[PDB]
C-alpha cells in the first residue's frame, strides 16, 4: 500500500481459534525436495501472508542434513515460501544470509534483518526493499541475536529487539527503532526483566507489545511494551501463575510480576501471548519438561493480576505429539473493525529426541482468532520417523 | 492426584503368558502416554518402552522387542503388558509409570508394581507355628513372642499380630527361599503386663492358596 501503516484497531474478541495454515513440510519431505528449516515465523505483506524460517542449506533427504541440529552455520538463510506450501528448493525465496532474523513490512515495503558471523564477530544487516541499507556490529561479542518472528511497524517505525551477551548471564539487550532501514534511535533494556531473549510481538492501538524468553533465571515471561511514537519502552513479567516458558516448575497459586518466577535454570523456548485484559490468551507447551503439545488458555488479566487462572482452553496439539517455538503474527492489512490475532507453532522433528534420523527439521501449524466458539482439533506434524530409515 | 493401580502378583511357569494391568485414575488417559519399567532384584530400573495412549503407538527398548506387548483397554483407561513364552529370566517386578511428555522421558507417577514369579514350583500352603518362650529376662519388662510360617509357595504371605491392632513391636522378617518353598518369622515384643493377660495372636493369610490361620500363642511355659 503506497503509505506506511498505523496500528489503529485493537484486537478482536478471541473466543476460540480456527486453522489458518499448516504446511505438511516434513510429511512432504520424505519425497519432494524440501529444505531442512528451523525457527519459522509467518509475516504478512499488504498483498499476501507467507511462512518464513531459517534454512540449513540441504534437503530433508539429502546427505548434508545430517547434523542440522547445529543452530549456527554459514549455510542458513531467511527464506519465504507461499502459505502452506513446503519450503522447497524451488519455491523458496531468499531474503538475507545468517542465523537469526526478524522481518516485517512497513506499509510501504518490507524490512528484513539477518545476523551472521562467528559468535564473537557476528554482524546484523538490515535489508529494506530487498537491498541492504544498514549494518550493526556486535556490542558485546557473544552471539548477537534478534526476534525469530515478525517485527511490527507504526508510521514508518519498526522496533526490533536484539540481545548480545550470554543466555546464562546478564546479557546486553538493546531495542532499535528503524525507519526506512536507517537507525532512528535505540535504547538499552529498561524495566524489570533480568534477561531478554528472542521476542515475539504484535500491535494494537499504537502500541507494539512483545512476550519473550527469560533464558537466564525465569520460568515466567518478560514482556516489553513499546511506544513506536515516543520511541520508548518498558519491561515487566506476566503476573499469572500459569507459567508459559518450558521447562517449567508446577504452577504456583501466586506468581511474580516483577522478578523471574524461579524453579528452572538456563533454559527456555520462544513463545507468545496476547495481553489484552479480560481478553487475554497465553500459549504454552502441555509438557512441563519438554516441547510436547501446545495449549491456548484464556487467563483473564494475566499480565497484571498475580493470582490469575485459566477460564477456558484450546489444545493446538496433543502432549503425545511434539511442539517447539511459537510466536505471533497478525494480518495488519485485513479488512474489518479489529485485528484477527494469530500465532504459529514450530513442530520439531528429528533429533535430539527422535534420534534415529540424523537430522532435525520441523512444520508450521498456525491458527487465528475466531469470535464464534468453534470446536477444536489437534494438529500433528504427522511424519513417521520410520520411513526415513 | 493420578492414582495408577496395577494387577496382583502372578506365578506362571515357563512358557506361559501373563496379563499385567495398569488402571489409570487421576488424569485424562489420552493426553499422557504409559511407560513400563522393569525392576529385577539386580540392575535396578529398566525402561521397556512407552505407549502412546492416543493412537496406540508402542515403542520398545531393544531387550523387549518381540516377547512383550504393551496394549490398552482405552475405555477402561487401562494399559496392559503381556509377556508371552515366559522365561524364568523374566522373574521380576514391573511398573507402569506415566510419561509426563511425548515418549516418556520423565515419569511423574508410578503404579504399585506387579510381581511375576516364573516357576515350576507347586503352591504349597504354609504350616504356621506359634513360637513362644521357654523363660528368661527378655531385656527388661518385656516378652517377645514369635511365629514361623514354613512351607508356603509362592510369596506373598500376610501376617498380622492381633488383627492389625498390635503394631508397636513387630519385626516381620523377609521371606527366604529354601529350594522349593519359603520360610518366614515375625517377632512382637509385648510388655510383661500384656501377656498371657491379653490374647496375642499370629494371623496369617496365604492369598495364593486361601489359607488363613490365626495361631494363638498359648503360654506354654
Ligand atoms: C468440542 O470443542 C470445544 C471447543 O474446542 C471443547 O471445549 C473446550 O474443551 C477444553 C477441554 O475441556 C476446555 O479447556 C479447559 O477449560 C478449563 C476452564 O473451566 C481450564 O481450566 C482447563 O485448563 C487446564 O487443563 C489442561 C488439561 O486438560 C491443562 O493441561 C492446563 O494446564 C490447565 O491445567 C492447569 O492449570 C492450572 C495451573 O496450572 C491448574 O488449575 C490445573 O491443575 C493444571 O495444572 C497442571 O497442568 C499444567 C500444564 O499442563 C502444569 O504446568 C501444572 O504444574 C500442573 O501439572 C482447560 O483449558 C475449554 O475450556 C473448552 N472451551 C470451550 C469453549 O468449550 C469441547 O469440550 C469439545 N466437545 C466435544 C464433544 O468434543
Ligand atoms: C499514520 O498516522 C500518522 C499519525 O500517527 C499520520 O500523520 C500518517 O499520515 C498516517 N499514515 C497512514 C497511511 O495512515
Ligand atoms: C552423519 O551421519 C552418519 C550416519 O548417516 C553418522 O555416522 C555421522 O557421524 C554423521 N555426522 C557426520 C559429521 O558425518
Ligand atoms: Ca525460561
Cβ-based neighbours of A326, under 8 Å, separated by 6 or more: A200, A269, A270, A271, A272, A283, A294, A343, A344, A345, A346
Specify whether B113 is located in the same domain as B195: no
The protein residue with its alpha carbon nearest to ligand 1, atom 43, reads A251
Q: How many domains does chain A have?
A: 1
What are residue A102's DSSP bridge partners? Answer: A113
A322: contact with B, CB 8 A cutoff: yes
Do residues B84 and B64 touch, judged by C-beta distance below 8 A?
no
Residue A192: how many CA atoms within 13 Å on its side-chain side? 16
| A313 C-beta closer than 6 A to ligand 1 | yes
Q: How far is A76 from chain B (nearest CA, A)?
A: 29
Residue A218: how many CA atoms within 13 Å on its side-chain side? 31
What are residue B184's DSSP bridge partners? Answer: B149
Cβ-based neighbours of A302, under 8 Å, separated by 6 or more: A238, A239, A240, A242, A273, A275, A280, A282, A308
Q: What are phi and psi of B207, to 5 degrees?
A: -55, -50
A289: contact with B, CB 8 A cutoff: yes
CB pairs under 8 A between A and B: 42
Specify whether B62 is located in the same domain as B161: no
Distance CA B172, CA B82 (A): 33
Distance CA A149, CA A376 (A): 25
SS3 A329: strand
A71 is catalytic: yes
Q: How far is A320 from chain B (nearest CA, A)?
A: 4
Do residues B46 and B64 touch, judged by C-beta distance below 8 A?
no
What are residue B102's DSSP bridge partners? Answer: none
| Helix, strand, coil percentages in chain B from 3-state DSSP, rounded to 5 | 10, 50, 40
In this structure, the number of other CB atoms found within 10 A of the CB of residue A316 comes to 25
The protein residue with its alpha carbon nearest to ligand 2, atom 4, reads A155
Q: What is the DSSP letter of A205?
A: T
Chain B positions touching A290 (Cβ under 8 A) are 101-102, 105-106
Q: Given an 8 Å threshold on Cβ–Cβ distance, is A290 in contact with B101? A: yes
Residue whose C-alpha is closest to residue B169's, from B136, B184, B191, B185: B191
Specify whether B30 is located in the same domain as B97: yes
A289: nearest CB among B30, B55, B105: B105
Specify whether B2 is located in the same domain as B25: yes
Cβ-based neighbours of A152, under 8 Å, separated by 6 or more: A7, A104, A158, A159, A201, A202, A203, A208, A228, A332
**Alpha helices, DSSP H, located in chain B:** none
Do residues A68 and A55 touch, judged by C-beta distance below 8 A?
no
Cβ-based neighbours of B157, under 8 Å, separated by 6 or more: B126, B149, B175, B182, B184, B204, B205, B206, B207
Specify whether B142 is located in the same domain as B67: no
Do residues B9 and B123 touch, judged by C-beta distance below 8 A?
no
A176 is catalytic: no
CATH number at residue B152: 2.60.40.10
Specify whether B44 is located in the same domain as B90: yes
Long-range Cβ contact pairs of B105-109 (< 8 A, separation 24 or more): B105/A289, B105/A290, B105/A353, B106/A288, B106/A289, B106/A290, B107/B35, B107/B37, B108/A288, B108/B2, B109/B1, B109/B2, B109/B4, B109/B26
Lining residues, ligand 3, CB within 6 Å = A 66-67, 358
Distance CA B64, CA B98 (A): 19
Specify whether B103 is located in the same domain as B148: no
Residues of the domain holding B155: 121-219
CATH number at residue A247: 2.120.10.10
Distance CA A272, CA B78 (A): 36
Residue with cell 509467518: A42
Tell whether residue A21 is among the known ligand binding residues. Answer: no
B31: nearest CB among A286, A288, A289: A286
- Cell numbers at B68, concatenated: 512383550
- Cell numbers at A14, concatenated: 478471541
SS3 B185: strand
Among A63, A66, A359, A389, residue to substitute to test ligand 3 (most atoms within 8 Å of Cβ): A66
Do residues B149 and B126 touch, judged by C-beta distance below 8 A?
yes
Specify whether B84 is located in the same domain as B182: no
Burial class (CB in 10 A: 0-12, 13-18, 19+), A33: middle
Which protein residues have their CB within 5 A of the ion that is ligand 4? A 214, 218, 245, 268
Method of structure determination: X-ray
B2, B27, B31, B33: best to mutate for the A interface, most A CBs within 10 A: B31
What are residue B117's DSSP bridge partners? Answer: B11
Specify whether B109 is located in the same domain as B155: no
Distance CA A208, CA A212 (A): 13
Burial class (CB in 10 A: 0-12, 13-18, 19+), A121: exposed
Specify whether B55 is located in the same domain as B75: yes
Residue with cell 542449506: A57
Q: How many domains does chain B have?
A: 2
Cβ-based neighbours of B66, under 8 Å, separated by 6 or more: none
Selected catalytic residue, list A176, A177, A202, A325: A325
Q: Ligand 2, closest atom to CA A155?
A: 1
Do residues A208 and A214 touch, judged by C-beta distance below 8 A?
no
Residue with cell 491392632: B165
Do residues A366 and A20 touch, judged by C-beta distance below 8 A?
yes
DSSP string of B19-44, one letter each residue: EEEEEEESS-GGGS-EEEEEE-SSS-
A154-188 exposure pattern, b = at least 16 Cβ within 10 A, e = fewer:
bbbbbbbbbbbbbbeeebbbbbbbbbbbeeeebbe
A230-248 exposure pattern, b = at least 16 Cβ within 10 A, e = fewer:
ebebebbbbbbbbbbbbbb
Run of H or E including A27: helix A25-28
Residues of the domain holding A63: 1-389
B89, B120, B151: which is the final residue of a domain?
B120
| A310 C-beta closer than 6 A to ligand 1 | yes
SS3 B164: helix
Pairing of strands A145-146, A157-165: antiparallel
Q: What is the DSSP letter of B69?
A: -
Specify whether B135 is located in the same domain as B116: no
Count helices and strands in chain A by DSSP H and E runs: 1, 24
| A251 C-beta closer than 6 A to ligand 1 | yes
Q: Given an 8 Å threshold on Cβ–Cβ distance, is A290 in contact with B52? A: no
SS3 A204: strand
Specify whether B9 is located in the same domain as B115: yes
Amino acid at each position: 500500500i503506497r503509505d506506511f501503516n498505523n496500528l489503529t484497531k485493537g484486537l478482536c474478541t478471541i473466543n476460540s481459534w480456527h486453522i489458518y495454515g499448516k504446511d505438511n513440510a516434513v510429511r512432504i519431505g520424505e519425497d519432494s525436495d524440501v529444505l531442512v528449516t528451523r525457527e519459522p515465523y509467518v509475516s504478512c505483506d499488504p498483498d499476501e501472508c507467507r511462512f518464513y524460517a531459517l534454512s540449513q542449506g540441504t534437503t530433508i533427504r539429502g546427505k548434508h542434513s545430517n547434523g542440522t541440529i547445529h543452530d549456527r552455520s554459514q549455510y542458513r538463510a531467511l527464506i519465504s515460501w507461499p502459505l502452506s506450501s513446503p519450503p522447497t528448493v524451488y519455491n523458496s525465496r531468499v531474503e538475507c544470509i545468517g542465523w537469526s532474523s526478524t522481518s516485517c513490512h512497513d506499509g510501504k515495503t518490507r524490512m528484513s534483518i539477518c545476523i551472521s558471523g562467528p559468535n564473537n564477530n557476528a554482524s546484523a544487516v538490515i535489508w529494506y526493499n530487498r537491498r541492504p541499507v544498514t549494518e550493526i556490529n556486535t556490542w558485546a561479542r557473544n552471539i548477537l541475536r534478534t526476534q525469530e518472528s515478525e517485527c511490527v511497524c507504526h508510521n514508518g517505525v519498526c522496533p526490533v529487539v536484539f540481545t548480545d551477551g550470554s543466555a546464562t548471564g546478564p546479557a546486553e539487550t538493546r531495542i532499535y527503532y528503524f525507519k526506512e532501514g536507517k537507525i532512528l534511535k535505540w535504547e538499552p533494556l529498561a524495566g524489570t526483566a533480568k534477561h531478554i531473549e528472542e521476542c515475539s510481538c504484535y500491535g494494537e492501538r499504537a502500541e507494539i507489545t512483545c512476550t519473550c524468553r527469560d533464558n537466564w533465571q525465569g520460568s515466567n515471561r518478560p514482556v516489553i511494551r513499546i511506544d513506536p511514537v515516543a520511541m520508548t519502552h518498558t519491561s515487566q513479567y506476566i503476573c499469572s501463575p500459569v507459567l508459559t516458558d518450558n521447562p517449567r516448575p508446577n504452577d504456583p497459586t501466586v506468581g511474580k510480576c516483577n522478578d523471574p518466577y524461579p524453579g528452572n535454570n538456563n533454559n527456555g523456548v520462544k513463545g507468545f501471548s496476547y495481553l489484552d485484559g479480560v481478553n487475554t490468551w497465553l500459549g504454552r507447551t502441555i509438557s512441563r519438561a519438554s516441547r510436547s503439545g501446545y495449549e491456548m488458555l484464556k487467563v483473564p488479566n494475566a499480565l497484571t493480576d498475580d493470582k490469575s487462572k485459566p477460564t477456558q482452553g484450546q489444545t493446538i496439539v496433543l502432549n503425545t505429539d511434539w511442539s517447539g517455538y511459537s510466536g505471533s503474527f497478525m494480518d495488519y492489512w485485513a479488512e474489518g473493525e479489529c485485528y484477527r490475532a494469530c500465532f504459529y507453532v514450530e513442530l520439531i522433528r528429528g533429533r535430539p529426541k527422535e534420534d534415529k534420523v540424523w537430522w532435525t527439521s520441523n512444520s508450521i501449524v498456525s491458527m487465528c482468532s475466531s469470535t464464534e466458539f468453534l470446536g477444536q482439533w489437534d494438529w500433528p506434524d504427522g511424519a513417521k520417523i520410520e520411513y526415513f530409515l | 492426584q493420578i492414582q495408577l493401580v496395577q494387577s496382583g502378583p502372578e506365578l506362571k511357569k515357563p512358557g506361559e503368558t501373563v496379563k499385567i494391568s495398569c488402571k489409570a485414575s487421576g488424569y485424562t488417559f489420552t493426553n499422557y502416554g504409559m511407560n513400563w519399567v522393569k525392576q529385577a532384584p539386580g540392575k535396578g530400573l529398566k525402561w521397556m518402552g512407552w505407549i502412546n495412549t492416543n493412537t496406540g503407538e508402542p515403542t520398545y527398548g531393544e531387550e523387549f522387542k518381540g516377547r512383550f506387548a504393551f496394549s490398552l483397554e482405552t475405555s477402561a483407561s487401562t494399559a496392559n503388558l503381556q509377556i508371552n513364552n515366559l522365561k524364568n529370566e523374566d522373574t521380576a517386578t514391573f511398573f507402569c509409570a506415566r510419561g509426563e511428555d511425548n515418549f516418556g522421558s520423565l515419569s511423574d507417577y508410578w503404579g504399585q508394581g506387579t510381581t511375576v514369579t516364573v516357576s515350576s514350583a507347586k503352591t504349597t500352603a504354609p504350616s504356621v507355628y506359634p513360637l513362644a518362650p521357654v523363660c528368661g529376662d527378655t531385656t527388661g519388662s518385656s516378652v517377645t513372642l514369635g511365629c514361623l510360617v514354613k512351607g508356603y509357595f509362592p510369596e506373598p504371605v500376610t501376617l498380622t499380630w492381633n488383627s492389625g491392632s498390635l503394631s508397636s513391636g513387630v519385626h516381620t522378617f523377609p521371606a527366604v527361599l529354601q529350594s522349593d518353598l519359603y520360610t518366614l518369622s515375625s517377632s512382637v515384643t509385648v510388655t510383661s503386663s500384656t501377656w498371657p493377660s491379653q490374647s496375642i495372636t499370629c494371623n496369617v493369610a496365604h492369598p495364593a492358596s486361601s489359607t488363613k490361620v490365626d495361631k494363638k500363642i498359648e503360654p506354654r511355659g
